[PDB]
Amino acid sequence: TTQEFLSKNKTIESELLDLLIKPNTDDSILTRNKQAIADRDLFDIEWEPGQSLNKLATEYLGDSFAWQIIADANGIDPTKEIDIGAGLKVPDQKALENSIKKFIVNSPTGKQLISDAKQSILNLIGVGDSNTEFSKTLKDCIGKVVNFSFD
Amino acid sequence: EEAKKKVKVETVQNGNLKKTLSEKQLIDGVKRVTEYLKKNISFQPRTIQNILSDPKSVIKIDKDTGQVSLFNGNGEFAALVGTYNGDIFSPS
Amino acid sequence: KYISTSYAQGGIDLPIDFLENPDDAKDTNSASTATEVDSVGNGTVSRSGV
Amino acid sequence: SKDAFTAWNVDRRPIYSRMPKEQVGTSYHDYIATDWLTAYWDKIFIECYDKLEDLPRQFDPLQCDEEYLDFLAPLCGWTAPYWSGDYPPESKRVLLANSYSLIWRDKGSLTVLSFVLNALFINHRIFVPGSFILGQSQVSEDTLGAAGWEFEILLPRDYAENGYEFRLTLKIASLFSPLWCKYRVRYDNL
Amino acid sequence: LNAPQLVVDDYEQLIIDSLVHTNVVSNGEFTDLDASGFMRPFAGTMAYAGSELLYKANLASIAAAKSFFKNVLGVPEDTGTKATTTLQFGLSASLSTDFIVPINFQVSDLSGTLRFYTIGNLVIPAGATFGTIEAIAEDIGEKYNVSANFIDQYSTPLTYLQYVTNIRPATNGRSGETIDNLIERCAQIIRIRNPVSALDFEQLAELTMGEGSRCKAIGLLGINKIVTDPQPGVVHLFLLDVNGNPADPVTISTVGATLQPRIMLGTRLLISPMEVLNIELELIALSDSSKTFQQLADDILEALKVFFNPANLTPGEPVLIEEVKFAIRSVGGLSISYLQMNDNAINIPMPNQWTIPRFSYIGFELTDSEGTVYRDNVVTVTNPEE
Amino acid sequence: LNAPQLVVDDYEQLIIDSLVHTNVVSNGEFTDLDASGFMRPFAGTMAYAGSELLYKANLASIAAAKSFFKNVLGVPEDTGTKATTTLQFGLSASLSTDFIVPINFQVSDLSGTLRFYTIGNLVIPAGATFGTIEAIAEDIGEKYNVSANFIDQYSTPLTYLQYVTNIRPATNGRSGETIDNLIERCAQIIRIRNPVSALDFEQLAELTMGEGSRCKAIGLLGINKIVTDPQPGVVHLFLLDVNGNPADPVTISTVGATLQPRIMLGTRLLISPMEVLNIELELIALSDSSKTFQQLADDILEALKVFFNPANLTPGEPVLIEEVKFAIRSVGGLSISYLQMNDNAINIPMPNQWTIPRFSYIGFELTDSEGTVYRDNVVTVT
Amino acid sequence: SKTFQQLADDILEALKVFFNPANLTPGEPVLIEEVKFAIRSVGGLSISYLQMNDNAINIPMPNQWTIPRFSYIGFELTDSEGTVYRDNVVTVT
C-alpha cells in the first residue's frame, strides 16, 4: 500500500506536468495597442492655440470620432493638457490602410487571412459593419432568447 | 438611412422591435422582470409560482422581440410574463 | 447578404437539441414483458430474452 | 470642438461646454435650459472621471480602499484558508503588499513565517531546541546540539492558552511552516 | 467578479436621478419630475447613452484583473469534462477471422438519451469472444455519470456482435467550473513553488494525476499511520484516483516519480491509497407539491451527488448533518422532517485523518399535502468497496 | 476569461441607436433623425463626451494593471531610462579647502548633442586632486550610451578644474519597453523558486561561484562527515573552486552568504571544501600510422583533459577504466593495448561521496606498425 | 469568510424577511427546519444549535388564525479561532 520515496533530482514525469506560468500576449486590455503605425506614414504637426483632437481628426481623417486613433498614435491622454508648440503625429487617411497586417492563420477547417492592427484602426475600418459579412451578423443574433437566472 | 426609414414605419407591436436589445438593456430588463415578479408573486397563477419556487428555473428574454418567458428546471416552456422593449416592461 | 453563409457546430456553438426535432422521438428500449416460462419445476423459470 | 483638457478639467462640463456658442443670441449657451438639462450628465461623467483617475491607486494595497482588499486577494494568490475575511484590514494590506516579493517567493523560511505572524499582530519567538541556550547554559560543562526539523513558537504570557492567538498561530504555522517539520506552539519561558 | 462599482449604471435610475438633479440645479424652476411624463423622451435618450457608456466604464478594474490572469500566466478557459467508461463487446460465436469494432461506435442507455462513443478501433482476435475499449460521453455534464451495466443499447448492428455493456461506472462528468474554482486554479499557480505545508494537497489532487482525484498530505506520519508517533522529515500522501477509488499502485508510482525531484533533499515521502467511508441516508420530507415525487427525488439525488463530490469534500473532516440538510433543502419545493445518516441523527466523524466520505444509499419517504406517501430507495455505488 | 472591450466599437451607431430609442420611448412620435432635429445635438455631444470617458477608462484600466505590476509584483514598467555614467573631475591644484561642484553641472561630448548633468553636489576634500560623481543623461534613449572618455566637454570653466571625463561608459539608456517584454518580466518574478533538491542546490552554488566550479549536495550528512550517523535536517555542500582546487574559506563564506537566506525553516546548511583524488595514467597503444606520434599525443591529452573536466565528472562516482579507454580511442587514429590507472587496470572507487577525480600525469608509450616507440610523460597538475 | 457584524446583520435581515407577514401563512406551525434553512441561506456560517421559544422543536400554532411574529434573536457566533461574538437584538417596534 505505502510506497517509500526518497529525494531525486531530474525526472520526466515531472517535466510532463511541469511549467505552468505562461507569458503569452493574448487579446486583452494591455495588448490592444501592440501594433504601431510606421513613422513614414504619419505627419508631424505642431500644437497651436485653438487646436483640439476633434479638429485634427476632422481635417486629416475626415471623421470626428477618429481622434482615438490619433491619441493612440501618440500615447496621449486626451483629458490631459497638450503644451503649446508640442509636437503631435497625425495618421494619414490613405496611409492608415497599410498598418493593417494580413497573415495566414491555420485552423482545422482551413487557412484564413486575418487582419491585425491596433484596435482603434480595427474599429474605424469596420465602422458601419461594412467589412464583416452578413453571415457573421446573423450568427451572433441566432441566440436571441438569453437564459437569465431568477432570484 | 435604414434607421430613419425604420423609425418612420410604425412598429409591429407583436414581432421584432425596431431596436434590438443590447446586453446592458437585457440586464436592465431582467432586473425589471424580477422586480415585477417579486412584487406580484401572490397574484401569479398557481403554475407560475410553482416554477418560480424552483431554484433551477430560468427566465428567457428574446433579444429581438423582447418577449420574456418562464422555463422550469427541465428546460421546457412553462409560461410567458410579458414584453420588454428598450425602456419599460409590459406584463401580459 | 444572400450569398454569405456560416456553419456552426453541433456542441461547440449550439446545444445539440437545437438540431433535432421532438417529433422524431428516439427509439428507447425496456425489459421485455413476454418472456417464456418453464413450468417443469427445474431451475429458474425465465427462458427467453436476457 | 474644444479640447478635452478644458472640457474635463477647467469647465468640468464635458457635454455642455461642447454645445455651440458662436451665434450669440440664438445658440445653446444663450438659453439656460441647455445648461440645466445637461448638468446631471456632466456631474455623472465627472464623478466617473475621478473614479477612473483614482483607479490605478486602488490596485496598491498600501493605498487602496478596504473595498478592494478582497478584490485584490486572488491576484496576490490568497484564496482558501490562506485568506480570511476576519483578518484586520491593516494585516490584509501588509500581507497583500509583500506577497510576490517575500511571502510566496520564500515560503517555508523563518523570515516568511515570522513576517506573517507579525503582520497579524502576534508577538512571537521562533526557538529551535538545542542543548546550548545562550541565556543559561554554562560554557564549562554544557554541550552543543541541534534539533534538526524541529522548532517551536513561543508566545508571551499576555495571551490566553488555546485562545485567539494560540489557535491563529497554529493555523499560520500549518499554512506556512514546512510540513515535515515538527512544531509546537508554547508559552515563552522567559 | 466581486469588484466595486465605480458609478451607478441603471436606465430607470439614471432617468429619475437626471430629472431630480435638473430640478435641483435650477431653484425649482423645472418641476416636471414625473419619470414617465413629458420629459421622459429627453431623459430616456440621454440615459440610454449614459447607461451604455457607464456599463463599460464599470468594467475597467475587472478587465485589468482578467488581463493579468490571462497574459502573464496563460490559464486555459475550462469548458467542461466528458464522462468516460470502459465498454466490453461480446461476440455471438467464435470467429475464424479477427472481428473489428470501428472507432466512434455509438452505445446508449435504455432510455436512449445518453450516448457514448468508442475512443478507437477495437480488434477482437479470431477465437476470442469479448473485448474491451474505452468510450467517451457525447457531451459534457454530470448527467453522464452512470452506473455499471447501464449503457448497453446500440443502434448500428455488427455481424455476430451479441452484446455490449460498460464494465465501469462512467465518471468525471463535469459541466464546467464556477468563477471561484477558476480563481482557485489561478491562485494555486501563483503559490505552488517548492511544495511545503500541504501544497502537496494541491499538486496531485488536480495535477499529475488527473481531474477528479483527491490527495491528503499529513506531516510527520510514519509507516504505522499513528498520529501519536511523529517522525520529523516525513510527509505522507493519501490518494484517491481519478475514478474515485483508493489509488492504484501504478498511480502511486507515477505520483512518486512526479514528486521526487520537488521534495526537500533528505526528506522521506510516503504515498498510500486513501480510504472511504460509506454514508447511507434516510430522508423523511414534506413536499409542497410544486414538483412531482420523481422530480423531487432526482433533484435531491443530483444535489447530494454534487455535495459528496470528492472535490467538494475535505478528507478527514466530519460530515455535518446540518450541512447535508441544507444541501437537500437547496433543491427547493420540499420541507425536511427527518434525516438519518448511518442509522443516527448525529454528525459522522471520519475514523482517521485520511478517510473521505462517499455516500452510497439513500431512501426517500416524501409526503405531500394530499397525503400520498412516496417511498423509494436508490443505491449509488457499484458495491460497498467501489 | 477574455477581458471585455471597454471602448464602444461604433459611436455613430450609438447616436443612431439613441435616436431610435427616442422613438421607442415616445411610441412613434419622435421621428426626427437629422442634425437639424432637437435631440441630435444633445445625443451627439453626449456620445463624444462618452467616447472621451471610455478612452480614459481604457487608459485607467491599463494603468491599474501597470500599477499592480509596479507595487505588488515588484516589476515597474519602463517608459524610457536616462543613461547614467560616472564622471571624474580632476583638479589642476591641491586646494587647502573643499572644492564644491554644484548640482546639474552640464557636461557634453564634442558635438554637444549628448548632454549629461551631475546628479548631486561633488565635494572634493582638501588635499585631493580628483573626485567622482554619477551623472545622468539629458533625455531618454539609446543614443546616450557612449564609451569611456567620450563625455568631456563643459561650457562653464571653473578655477582649478583641469579636466572632466567619464571613466565609465554610459549605460542603461532605453527608449521604451514593448508590452511583450513587460509581460515576460512580470512572469519571471512569479517563477522565482528557492532551491529544494540536491541538483537545485548544486546549480545555485555554481551560479554564485562561477563557470568552471562544481558542487555536490548531500542530505543528512553531519559536520563530522560520518555517513553511518545521519543528522536530521542537514544539507551538506561540497565545493570545488573555479580553478579546480577545493574551495578556500573565502569562497565558502561567499557562497554561504548567498545560500543562507534561501534555506527554509528546520534545515541546517553546512558547507565544506571538496576532496580531490589524483589520477595517474600509463598508456601503451598501437598507432595505425594515420597520424604522427606528436599529433596523437596532443589529441589524447586534449581528449583526457575534456574527459576529466569537473563539469563532466560526477563527484563520488568511480572512474571506470572502460570509459577512459573509450575516451582515448574516440580520437580514432590509435588502438589501445594497455591502460593503467594508479598502477592498476581496474575501476577506481572513490573513498567517499564528496571526492572528484583530477588526473595529474599521463605516460604515453605509443608504437606504430614499423615498431617505432614514442615515449613521453605529461604532468597536467598545476 | 465574513465579519461577525456582517453575519449578524445578514442573519437579521434574512429572519426579518422570513417572518414577514406576507411570507407567513396563519395557523401553520413554524418549522425549526425552515428557520435553520433561512439562517443558513446567508452562507457564511454553519448552524449548530437553534432554539425557538426555549425549545428545539416545531412550534404549533394555537389556532388557525395565529400569525407568528419575530420578537427577539440571541446571537452566539464563533469562528475557527474561538472568538465569540454575543448579541441580543429585540425586533419589536
Side-chain angles (χ1 to χ4, degrees):
Chain A
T1 133
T2 332
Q3 257 170 111
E4 170 39 49
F5 292 134
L6 280 321
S7 199
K8 230 234 237 345
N9 283 335
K10 261 169 104 147
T11 326
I12 78 128
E13 295 85 357
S14 121
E15 268 340 274
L16 239 26
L17 235 276
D18 204 77
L19 14 125
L20 300 170
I21 310 115
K22 276 310 136 342
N24 27 53
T25 138
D26 338 272
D27 219 17
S28 56
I29 66 161
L30 65 156
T31 60
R32 307 271 199 259
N33 205 147
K34 262 159 19 165
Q35 298 85 12
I37 304 107
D39 208 44
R40 36 145 191 291
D41 293 326
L42 304 166
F43 293 136
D44 298 329
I45 71 105
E46 209 101 68
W47 197 264
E48 76 223 272
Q51 191 113 60
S52 68
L53 296 179
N54 183 267
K55 277 183 64 177
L56 285 172
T58 306
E59 317 182 14
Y60 288 96
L61 292 168
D63 165 280
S64 44
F65 283 107
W67 70 268
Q68 274 116 314
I69 291 178
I70 299 172
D72 281 333
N74 287 306
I76 286 326
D77 187 359
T79 52
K80 283 324 132 206
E81 183 178 2
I82 323 230
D83 343 287
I84 278 277
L88 269 205
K89 298 190 156 102
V90 180
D92 304 19
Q93 172 32 273
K94 71 142 289 313
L96 204 62
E97 55 60 20
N98 64 31
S99 42
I100 306 296
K101 267 38 154 133
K102 281 310 208 153
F103 30 62
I104 287 170
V105 86
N106 283 290
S107 169
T109 62
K111 298 292 180 65
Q112 296 152 46
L113 261 201
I114 274 177
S115 304
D116 207 62
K118 55 163 37 60
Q119 190 80 63
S120 289
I121 302 175
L122 276 205
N123 309 335
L124 184 98
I125 286 318
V127 78
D129 302 89
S130 63
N131 57 335
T132 196
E133 63 185 342
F134 187 92
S135 155
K136 303 302 154 263
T137 85
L138 236 191
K139 183 180 68 65
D140 57 68
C141 85
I142 262 274
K144 14 186 236 25
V145 244
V146 42
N147 285 54
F148 261 130
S149 111
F150 183 81
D151 210 8
Chain B
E1 157 218 302
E2 332 160 322
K4 73 166 54 133
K5 150 222 317 182
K6 99 159 64 183
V7 146
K8 293 179 179 179
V9 151
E10 154 140 8
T11 206
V12 172
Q13 300 278 24
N14 294 316
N16 282 53
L17 325 161
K18 26 203 174 179
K19 183 180 68 65
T20 279
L21 297 176
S22 91
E23 310 302 81
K24 179 62 173 171
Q25 272 189 338
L26 287 174
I27 291 171
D28 284 356
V30 86
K31 211 145 44 193
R32 304 282 97 73
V33 167
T34 314
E35 289 171 4
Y36 168 86
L37 286 199
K38 270 190 269 134
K39 162 126 64 153
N40 295 74
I41 182 51
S42 37
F43 301 101
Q44 279 326 289
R46 179 60 178 163
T47 64
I48 310 217
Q49 64 201 27
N50 265 7
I51 50 176
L52 277 180
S53 89
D54 194 327
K56 260 150 46 53
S57 159
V58 48
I59 61 171
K60 291 179 179 179
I61 316 196
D62 207 301
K63 181 200 286 335
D64 300 336
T65 75
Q67 179 72 193
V68 186
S69 302
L70 262 298
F71 291 71
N72 52 358
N74 298 315
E76 92 204 322
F77 169 73
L80 54 163
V81 292
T83 316
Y84 183 68
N85 60 1
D87 54 308
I88 53 102
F89 167 60
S90 292
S92 68
Chain C
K1 194 158 106 85
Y2 296 96
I3 299 187
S4 64
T5 166
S6 160
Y7 294 101
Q9 286 75 49
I12 312 148
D13 263 356
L14 305 126
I16 207 81
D17 55 290
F18 262 61
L19 316 171
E20 52 205 292
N21 68 106
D23 292 0
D24 242 298
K26 24 99 172 320
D27 289 71
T28 83
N29 210 346
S30 90
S32 208
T33 40
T35 88
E36 49 146 356
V37 179
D38 221 312
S39 291
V40 154
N42 206 358
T44 91
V45 306
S46 293
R47 279 155 48 50
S48 47
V50 308
Chain D
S1 304
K2 43 166 39 174
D3 51 61
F5 170 71
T6 317
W8 288 84
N9 293 305
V10 189
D11 294 44
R12 312 210 69 75
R13 297 294 297 273
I15 297 159
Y16 177 56
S17 185
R18 256 66 170 270
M19 298 314 258
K21 318 189 173 83
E22 183 65 13
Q23 307 260 98
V24 171
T26 63
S27 53
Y28 282 104
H29 272 259
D30 290 325
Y31 296 86
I32 198 163
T34 309
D35 183 72
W36 292 342
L37 295 153
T38 60
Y40 177 79
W41 304 111
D42 282 328
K43 176 215 195 77
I44 293 313
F45 277 26
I46 292 303
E47 309 202 86
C48 189
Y49 181 80
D50 293 336
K51 294 291 181 32
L52 296 166
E53 277 260 281
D54 262 47
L55 197 73
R57 201 270 312 282
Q58 306 300 105
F59 277 67
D60 186 1
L62 300 172
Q63 282 339 114
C64 84
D65 298 328
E66 283 55 12
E67 32 193 356
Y68 284 82
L69 292 178
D70 302 89
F71 167 71
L72 298 179
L75 301 185
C76 299
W78 293 84
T79 194
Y82 292 93
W83 192 243
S84 175
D86 212 317
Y87 288 171
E90 225 77 9
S91 300
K92 293 184 178 179
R93 286 185 192 288
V94 179
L95 294 176
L96 289 194
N98 322 271
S99 299
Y100 287 98
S101 67
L102 171 63
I103 289 160
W104 305 132
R105 160 193 321 263
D106 295 329
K107 207 219 218 182
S109 164
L110 168 140
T111 63
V112 173
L113 192 137
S114 190
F115 185 85
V116 172
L117 281 176
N118 279 311
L120 297 172
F121 303 99
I122 300 165
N123 316 115
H124 71 287
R125 183 158 70 83
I126 304 310
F127 164 75
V128 182
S131 66
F132 205 92
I133 315 287
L134 292 174
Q136 61 274 47
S137 55
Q138 262 289 297
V139 52
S140 90
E141 71 274 17
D142 281 321
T143 172
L144 310 170
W149 284 301
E150 335 202 2
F151 78 100
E152 274 142 8
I153 309 159
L154 314 180
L155 306 169
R157 194 87 55 205
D158 304 338
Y159 309 144
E161 56 94 346
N162 298 267
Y164 176 37
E165 297 88 344
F166 273 59
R167 295 179 47 197
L168 185 45
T169 305
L170 278 161
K171 188 215 199 209
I172 290 316
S174 67
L175 289 174
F176 288 90
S177 174
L179 190 56
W180 54 89
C181 281
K182 176 211 279 263
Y183 64 95
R184 189 231 323 269
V185 182
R186 209 164 54 70
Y187 263 137
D188 199 355
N189 34 25
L190 299 176
Chain E
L1 192 49
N2 42 7
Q5 178 196 10
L6 310 174
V7 283
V8 152
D9 184 1
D10 183 74
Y11 181 66
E12 207 66 33
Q13 198 59 42
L14 276 176
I15 290 171
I16 298 163
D17 288 334
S18 65
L19 288 177
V20 172
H21 191 252
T22 306
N23 163 50
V24 161
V25 162
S26 42
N27 301 27
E29 203 87 59
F30 167 84
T31 65
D32 210 288
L33 264 38
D34 191 353
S36 68
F38 309 120
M39 294 300 293
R40 176 75 167 201
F42 181 89
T45 189
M46 299 297 255
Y48 175 82
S51 76
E52 306 264 5
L53 297 158
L54 297 181
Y55 170 67
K56 300 175 135 324
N58 288 309
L59 296 170
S61 64
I62 191 48
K66 266 161 202 245
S67 70
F68 161 74
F69 271 141
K70 167 169 226 164
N71 291 299
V72 310
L73 56 141
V75 279
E77 186 182 322
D78 183 59
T79 88
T81 302
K82 284 192 206 105
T84 58
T85 189
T86 299
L87 302 174
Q88 169 182 353
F89 296 78
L91 304 182
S92 178
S94 178
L95 303 187
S96 207
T97 49
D98 44 286
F99 193 66
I100 312 236
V101 182
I103 191 172
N104 266 56
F105 191 85
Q106 198 211 264
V107 204
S108 68
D109 56 345
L110 262 181
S111 296
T113 181
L114 309 175
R115 276 177 305 284
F116 286 38
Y117 300 87
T118 53
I119 290 330
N121 296 313
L122 175 65
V123 176
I124 307 164
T129 54
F130 69 92
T132 66
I133 199 159
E134 303 260 352
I136 195 171
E138 182 182 7
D139 190 47
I140 75 168
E142 295 103 335
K143 66 165 202 215
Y144 287 94
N145 298 323
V146 300
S147 66
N149 289 284
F150 206 68
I151 316 168
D152 45 63
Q153 310 300 320
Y154 62 100
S155 177
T156 66
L158 281 163
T159 315
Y160 294 117
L161 176 63
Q162 185 180 359
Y163 71 89
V164 62
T165 185
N166 50 343
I167 302 322
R168 296 184 317 100
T171 53
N172 317 130
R174 206 164 43 71
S175 299
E177 35 182 273
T178 79
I179 191 46
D180 58 88
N181 294 324
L182 164 67
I183 279 297
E184 179 297 355
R185 210 166 48 106
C186 289
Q188 79 179 204
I189 312 171
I190 293 167
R191 50 155 222 277
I192 46 62
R193 323 145 212 195
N194 293 352
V196 311
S197 75
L199 327 172
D200 304 318
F201 211 65
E202 296 263 301
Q203 293 254 12
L204 305 318
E206 69 268 3
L207 323 169
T208 88
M209 206 178 35
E211 201 252 359
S213 38
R214 256 290 176 178
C215 178
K216 174 64 177 176
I218 296 165
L220 300 121
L221 188 67
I223 204 82
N224 285 319
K225 287 150 185 195
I226 288 166
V227 174
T228 63
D229 177 68
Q231 293 181 353
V234 183
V235 185
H236 210 133
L237 292 183
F238 297 84
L239 263 56
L240 192 96
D241 54 39
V242 72
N243 267 262
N245 302 347
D248 193 312
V250 293
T251 71
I252 302 295
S253 176
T254 298
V255 60
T258 301
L259 264 178
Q260 263 192 352
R262 295 135 187 278
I263 57 183
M264 176 84 75
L265 165 85
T267 57
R268 198 158 42 110
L269 185 69
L270 278 307
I271 308 168
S272 60
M274 201 174 323
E275 296 173 356
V276 287
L277 171 63
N278 287 313
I279 305 293
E280 291 186 349
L281 297 172
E282 308 269 7
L283 174 62
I284 304 169
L286 180 73
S287 177
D288 69 347
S289 295
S290 68
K291 301 175 188 172
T292 64
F293 291 116
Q294 289 80 347
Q295 190 63 44
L296 259 180
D298 279 299
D299 267 354
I300 295 169
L301 195 60
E302 148 171 11
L304 284 177
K305 295 190 141 147
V306 169
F307 178 79
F308 285 102
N309 200 344
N312 299 324
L313 289 165
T314 307
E317 296 309 324
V319 181
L320 300 178
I321 191 159
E322 284 71 16
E323 272 306 322
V324 186
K325 302 206 259 160
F326 169 71
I328 290 175
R329 256 293 314 178
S330 297
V331 153
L334 85 165
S335 174
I336 291 168
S337 298
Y338 185 59
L339 184 70
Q340 259 192 352
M341 332 159 54
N342 297 150
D343 314 84
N344 247 312
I346 67 170
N347 300 319
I348 302 270
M350 315 308 305
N352 47 27
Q353 297 272 328
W354 51 94
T355 304
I356 192 77
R358 172 182 73 123
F359 103 102
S360 56
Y361 161 81
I362 172 168
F364 298 101
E365 179 178 359
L366 309 170
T367 307
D368 59 347
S369 64
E370 169 215 320
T372 91
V373 171
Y374 182 84
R375 333 217 47 191
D376 210 279
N377 310 265
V378 173
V379 178
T380 62
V381 305
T382 333
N383 42 78
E385 183 178 2
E386 55 97 39
Chain F
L1 319 171
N2 41 4
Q5 179 144 347
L6 293 183
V7 306
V8 154
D9 300 320
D10 196 21
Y11 284 100
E12 319 83 332
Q13 200 36 69
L14 187 44
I15 300 168
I16 299 172
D17 286 311
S18 89
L19 283 155
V20 173
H21 198 24
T22 331
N23 206 32
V24 171
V25 166
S26 71
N27 319 293
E29 183 241 306
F30 268 92
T31 71
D32 222 57
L33 257 81
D34 45 357
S36 266
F38 187 89
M39 296 291 347
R40 177 85 109 80
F42 288 94
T45 317
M46 182 135 192
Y48 195 98
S51 62
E52 273 167 42
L53 180 70
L54 288 190
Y55 191 85
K56 156 66 98 188
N58 207 12
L59 295 182
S61 71
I62 293 168
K66 308 261 196 70
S67 70
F68 173 75
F69 295 164
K70 168 170 157 261
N71 299 318
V72 185
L73 272 194
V75 42
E77 195 228 4
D78 170 70
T79 41
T81 38
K82 300 159 89 177
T84 57
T85 191
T86 292
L87 293 180
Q88 168 171 348
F89 299 7
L91 298 176
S92 64
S94 167
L95 281 175
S96 66
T97 62
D98 292 340
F99 188 79
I100 296 326
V101 168
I103 211 188
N104 292 316
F105 188 78
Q106 202 223 69
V107 303
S108 63
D109 69 84
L110 197 40
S111 299
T113 295
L114 314 172
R115 275 162 309 266
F116 285 28
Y117 305 94
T118 55
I119 70 156
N121 283 320
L122 177 59
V123 177
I124 296 166
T129 54
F130 70 99
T132 59
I133 189 167
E134 272 215 352
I136 193 171
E138 190 211 320
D139 201 17
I140 54 138
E142 294 90 15
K143 78 214 280 303
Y144 285 88
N145 294 314
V146 295
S147 65
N149 300 318
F150 265 58
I151 304 269
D152 47 356
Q153 310 297 320
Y154 56 93
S155 177
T156 70
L158 290 179
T159 47
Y160 299 155
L161 178 61
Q162 181 159 356
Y163 69 84
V164 164
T165 190
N166 50 341
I167 48 178
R168 272 181 43 213
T171 47
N172 300 321
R174 297 171 273 276
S175 211
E177 190 192 18
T178 59
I179 200 53
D180 328 79
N181 310 150
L182 174 77
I183 278 172
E184 174 92 23
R185 197 146 52 97
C186 292
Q188 278 266 79
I189 285 287
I190 297 170
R191 290 201 187 110
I192 205 66
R193 217 191 66 176
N194 276 351
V196 80
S197 83
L199 171 89
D200 275 354
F201 267 109
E202 290 155 18
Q203 303 216 288
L204 184 52
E206 318 300 6
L207 198 298
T208 316
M209 296 204 267
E211 253 287 278
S213 175
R214 203 169 179 63
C215 159
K216 168 58 137 62
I218 305 171
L220 269 277
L221 182 60
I223 195 161
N224 43 52
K225 270 180 272 324
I226 291 169
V227 193
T228 71
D229 175 53
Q231 274 190 36
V234 178
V235 176
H236 223 114
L237 291 175
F238 295 92
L239 313 179
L240 183 118
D241 201 345
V242 76
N243 42 56
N245 311 134
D248 67 69
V250 201
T251 311
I252 295 318
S253 290
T254 304
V255 92
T258 311
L259 278 156
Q260 209 64 17
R262 314 260 288 161
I263 63 129
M264 56 207 36
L265 214 161
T267 313
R268 313 187 29 234
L269 184 65
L270 312 182
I271 309 173
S272 177
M274 248 201 201
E275 315 239 29
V276 174
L277 176 64
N278 280 317
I279 304 294
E280 298 165 350
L281 289 172
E282 184 218 299
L283 173 66
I284 303 170
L286 183 75
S287 176
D288 68 351
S289 296
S290 72
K291 302 182 280 193
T292 69
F293 281 117
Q294 191 58 40
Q295 274 145 252
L296 268 179
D298 309 346
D299 302 2
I300 298 169
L301 181 69
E302 217 62 20
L304 281 183
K305 259 136 47 193
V306 170
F307 179 79
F308 287 110
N309 213 18
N312 286 320
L313 303 173
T314 310
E317 302 313 320
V319 189
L320 308 177
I321 192 164
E322 301 287 330
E323 300 282 348
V324 187
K325 266 135 74 73
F326 176 67
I328 297 172
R329 168 52 165 137
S330 302
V331 198
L334 63 103
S335 175
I336 292 170
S337 302
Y338 292 107
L339 184 62
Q340 311 264 289
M341 329 176 32
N342 290 329
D343 291 329
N344 273 316
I346 53 174
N347 307 323
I348 296 177
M350 320 286 264
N352 64 34
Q353 292 77 354
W354 49 96
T355 303
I356 212 180
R358 186 263 284 285
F359 92 114
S360 60
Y361 176 97
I362 179 172
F364 288 110
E365 265 189 3
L366 304 183
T367 317
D368 57 353
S369 70
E370 313 325 328
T372 291
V373 182
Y374 168 83
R375 292 185 178 178
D376 198 4
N377 307 355
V378 189
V379 185
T380 59
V381 85
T382 46
Chain G
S1 67
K2 229 189 314 291
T3 66
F4 282 123
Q5 203 68 307
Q6 263 166 324
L7 264 177
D9 300 1
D10 299 3
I11 298 164
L12 191 67
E13 278 71 298
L15 281 181
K16 286 176 163 356
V17 157
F18 181 79
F19 284 102
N20 214 18
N23 289 319
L24 300 172
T25 301
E28 293 325 292
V30 184
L31 303 177
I32 193 160
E33 297 290 334
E34 300 282 347
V35 182
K36 267 206 217 83
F37 176 66
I39 298 169
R40 178 70 189 63
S41 297
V42 171
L45 86 172
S46 177
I47 295 172
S48 300
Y49 292 105
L50 176 63
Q51 286 194 356
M52 317 219 309
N53 285 329
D54 293 328
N55 271 315
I57 60 172
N58 301 326
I59 308 287
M61 262 17 227
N63 29 72
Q64 11 254 284
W65 54 97
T66 358
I67 176 135
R69 183 178 67 194
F70 190 30
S71 147
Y72 165 82
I73 177 53
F75 294 113
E76 258 206 68
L77 303 182
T78 318
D79 56 355
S80 158
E81 281 121 41
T83 293
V84 182
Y85 169 76
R86 213 175 281 89
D87 198 4
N88 41 358
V89 178
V90 183
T91 66
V92 81
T93 49

